[PDB]
């Protein structure tokens, strides 16, 4: 079913909401995990895409989520996809009450359903290929001159495009699906200053970990196979201690550790995935400078991560990791109403900024975010947020 | 005693350098005036030049309502004039900004407005004076001069909304902090110091072959 169906089935009955599913243009990027030179199998291509969502109520935004999906291709039919959950926030300006927990789980169900091949149709290359082009390497003089010699010679000032420079791939509809996230509460992630709002509920470290752990639990049971790999890791804690939280989980296979183990290449840098704004990436790049990357084993990485302040002087954080196959075969190219794919990074940023760029220390910002987001979609993109009729009893 | 001489001289320089800077500055102000004269002449021949510059400039979008762009798309000309040339009664930092809008059928009027910005005493803050402008017919609801009571609950609500539009920026003065268009001074300065002086840099960037800039 569609994104629109999913959200409605978790929002209160009779109630009306609106939402925004923004999506980046799938860009061919470097490997999620740093590859080693002398290695049999290294990635062929890594396709990165961002899904950013926001919910609105009565003309106010109140929730947002930012998730990256990474599709890695090793060869012909050997693929693999990873869903990385970056940020999730609320600003406490919802007039009504809702389960953010269920909204968040639902949006991930949706993402899980998407056929990986969807990000593989047209992919923006990291570096592309008769001259006479105006690009970043074009002083304004050059550019104006160019438009001159292109007017004098041609009727107008545009060219030819058939234009196909724009990658394309395939892989099996059912692949290995990974989910990775790093819990770390903070006053706000996507709604600046919203922490100054009294009605905003902040989870603490231990509260957040359980919160996320429950959502993944639900996804493990309902969306994955009974042999799926579920790993939990709580930096600064005892394996006995974590096993105790895990006794809380309803899914049977939760174990301590992570999904990076691999006895092949037992060296941190060749195993640890590097995501946006992630502490794992952080600590890795820290070693790159202080030159130790080829000296810290995977085992040591975790032990050292715990030290060096950050974790040592901050509340409970956890690393969750999932790795298995989904019950149903993920096969769902989202409709124009499931997603909005801006023409460029520039437009993507600009629409996002209407939200993550506002000041939420008052209801003003959250109302501003809503109007600016619809006005803009309508004006410059000829669209409009989706409306929702909630349909969940009690 | 030859020290009382040195010191007394150094003081003269001290009261001088102030009036010297004013000079090196007015020199630039002058050198640049005709340069913009020429450049503007060309610009005026280019279709949609300013509509394009103002949708390309990334920072400018942040100051104003998304909806204002329907009216901003209608800017035929922007001319910045540094007052210090027309009389030494002005701060080398003072300037006026003239806009021309080509209106829209049955919604927004055609018009040309000049808002004046000049530094006021106290290092000096930048201030302005309100100036008339014909708010779009769409913006009736949030029109300050169409609101019966700005202090009423639904009155303060609609008013604060209109104060976030670029039309609301034409009222900004700099003297009622928190009350008027937000950062009206920063925006003015953006025009005088970045947009106007570099419009061409942004037009050329809007003109990149291939969607993805």
């Amino acid at each position: 079913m569609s994104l629109n169906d999913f959200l409605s089935s978790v929002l209160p009955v009779s109630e009306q909401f609106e939402y925004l599913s923004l999506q980046s243009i799938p860009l061919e990027t470097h490997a999620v995990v740093t590859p080693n030179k002398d290695d049999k199998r290294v990635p062929k291509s890594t396709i990165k895409t961002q899904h950013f969502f926001s919910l609105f109520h009565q003309g106010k935004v109140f929730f947002s989520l930012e998730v990256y999906v990474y599709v890695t291709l090793w060869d012909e039919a050997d693929a693999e996809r990873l869903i990385f959950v970056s940020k999730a926030d609320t600003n406490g300006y919802c007039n009504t009450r809702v389960s953010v927990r269920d909204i968040t789980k639902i949006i991930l169900e949706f993402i899980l359903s998407i056929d990986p091949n969807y990000y593989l149709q047209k992919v923006k290359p990291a570096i592309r290929s008769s001259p006479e082009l105006i690009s970043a390497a074009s002083t304004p003089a050059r550019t104006l001159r160019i438009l001159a010699r292109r007017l004098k010679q041609s009727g107008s000032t545009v060219l030819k495009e058939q234009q196909d420079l724009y990658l394309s791939f395939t892989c099996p509809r059912e692949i290995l699906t990974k989910i990775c996230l790093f819990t770390r509460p903070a006053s706000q992630y996507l709604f600046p200053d919203s922490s100054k709002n009294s009605k905003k509920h902040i989870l603490n470290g231990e509260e957040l970990m359980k919160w996320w752990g429950f959502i993944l639990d639900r996804l493990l049971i309902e969306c994955f196979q009974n042999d799926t790999q579920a790993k939990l890791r709580i930096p600064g804690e005892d394996p006995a201690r974590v096993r105790s939280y895990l006794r809380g989980m309803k899914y049977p296979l939760w174990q301590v550790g992570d999904i990076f183990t691999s006895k092949e290449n037992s060296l941190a840098v060749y195993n640890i995935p590097l995501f946006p704004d992630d502490p794992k990436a952080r600590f890795i790049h820290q070693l790159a400078e202080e030159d130790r990357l080829l000296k810290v084993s995977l085992s040591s990485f975790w032990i050292e991560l715990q030290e060096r302040q950050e974790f040592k002087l901050s509340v409970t954080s956890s690393v969750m990791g999932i790795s298995g196959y989904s019950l149903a075969t993920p096969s769902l190219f989202p409709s124009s109403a499931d997603v909005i794919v801006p023409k460029s990074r520039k437009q993507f940023r600009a629409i996002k900024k209407y939200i993550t760029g506002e000041e939420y220390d008052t209801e003003e910002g959250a109302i501003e975010a809503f109007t600016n987001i619809r006005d803009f979609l309508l004006l410059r993109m000829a669209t409009n947020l989706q409306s929702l009729t909630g349909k969940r009893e009690h | 005693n030859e020290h009382a001489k040195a010191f007394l001289g150094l003081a003269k320089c001290e009261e001088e350098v102030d009036a010297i800077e004013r000079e090196v500055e007015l020199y630039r102000l002058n050198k640049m005036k005709p340069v913009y004269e020429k450049r503007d002449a060309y610009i005026d021949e280019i279709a949609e030049f300013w509509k394009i510059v103002l949708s390309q400039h990334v920072s400018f979008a942040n100051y104003i309502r998304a909806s204002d762009f329907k009216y901003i798309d209608t800017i035929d000309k922007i001319k910045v004039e540094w007052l210090a040339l027309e009389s030494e009664m002005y701060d080398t930092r003072d300037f006026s900004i003239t806009f021309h809008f080509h209106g829209i059928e049955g919604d927004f009027k055609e018009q040309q407005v000049t808002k004046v910005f000049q530094i006021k005493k106290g290092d000096g803050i930048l201030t302005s004076e309100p100036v008339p402008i014909e708010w779009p017919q769409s913006y009736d609801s949030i029109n300050p001069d169409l609101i019966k009571d700005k202090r009423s609950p639904e009155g303060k609500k609609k008013y604060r909304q209109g104060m976030k539009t670029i039309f609301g920026w034409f009222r900004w003065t700099g003297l009622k902090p928190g009350k008027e268009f937000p950062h009206g001074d920063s925006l003015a300065s953006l025009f005088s110091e970045e947009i106007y002086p570099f419009c061409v840099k942004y037009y050329a960037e809007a003109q990149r072959d291939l969607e993805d800039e």
Partner: peptide, 4 residues
Amino acid sequence: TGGK
């Protein structure tokens, strides 16, 4: 100079 906040910017939004």
